Amino acid sequence: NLYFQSNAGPSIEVYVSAVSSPSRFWVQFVGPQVAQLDDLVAHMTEYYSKKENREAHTLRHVSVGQVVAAVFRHDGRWYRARVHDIRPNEFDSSQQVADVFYLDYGDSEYVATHELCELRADLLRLRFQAMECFLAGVRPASDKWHPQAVERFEELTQVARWKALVSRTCTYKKTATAEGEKDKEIPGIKLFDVTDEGELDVGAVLVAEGWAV
Numbered sequence: 001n002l003y004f005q006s007n008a009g010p011s012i013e014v015y016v017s018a019v020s021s022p023s024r025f026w027v028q029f030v031g032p033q034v035a036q037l038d039d040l041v042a043h044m045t046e047y048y049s050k051k052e053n054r055e056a057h058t059l060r061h062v063s064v065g066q067v068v069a070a071v072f073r074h075d076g077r078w079y080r081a082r083v084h085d086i087r088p089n090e091f092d093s094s095q096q097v098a099d100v101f102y103l104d105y106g107d108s109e110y111v112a113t114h115e116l117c118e119l120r121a122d123l124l125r126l127r128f129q130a131m132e133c134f135l136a137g138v139r140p141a142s143d144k145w146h147p148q149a150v151e152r153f154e155e156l157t158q159v160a161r162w163k164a165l166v167s168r169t170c171t172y173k174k175t176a177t178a179e180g181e182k183d184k185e186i187p188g189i190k191l192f193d194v195t196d197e198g199e200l201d202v203g204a205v206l207v208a209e210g211w212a213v
């Protein structure tokens with residue numbers, strides 16, 4: 001299930017961009033691709049906000065695993081997302097709803113398939129910014145996490161508020177792949193809110209407040 005890492009590199013700086021729980025969150029690396037991302041959102045948003053452009057990128061078919069353009073309901077801007085699943089709506093037949101994963105951020109929302117657009121191919125150039133992680137060295141106190149544990153983890157990381165943190169990789173878990181192929185590895189990291197005083201260890205705060213062990 002889970003392996004230790006005797007050869008961690010130097011720690012790096014990241015923003016926590018989305019959280020599901022301490023066992024499953026997404027970071028973006030601090031650096032020049034963030035501003036490239038910013039530029040990309042603005043561009044996609046100016047572009048897909050015109051009808052003419054939506055109609056030249058109307059989806060006649062949509063598939064699970066497909067990368068598309070999608071509005072995020074909380075700000076009305078356009079993002080690159082991957083269709084994770086499609087589910088029916090029994091009260092409206094004109095509307096299947098797609099579970100989409102916002103690839104540069106890591107959150108997932110249900111969007112009506114009607115409002116997705118084909119993603120113009122040049123918009124794939126920039127690397128997908130969201131890296132899945134989990135927090136090393138903690139487990140929930142008897143994703144099996146208590147909701148307020150998750151909540152507090154969102155406060156400590158200041159999820160989605162562009163607060164830079166220091167990340168050290170300590171463990172990992174292997175992810176399965178096509179047979180014979182190399183396995184992927186999700187990193188188990190520790191996060192620190194570094195300052196002149198010293199460091200806030202986010203997981204150590206969770207353990208002390210009784211949310212984790």
Ligand SMILES: C/N=C(\NC)NCCC[C@H](N)C(=O)O
Nearest residue numbers: 072074075079102105107160
């Ligand atoms: C966290 N996931 C995002 N997109 C998929 N975020 C995009 C930016 C959200 C915007 N700042 C806002 O206030 O809504």
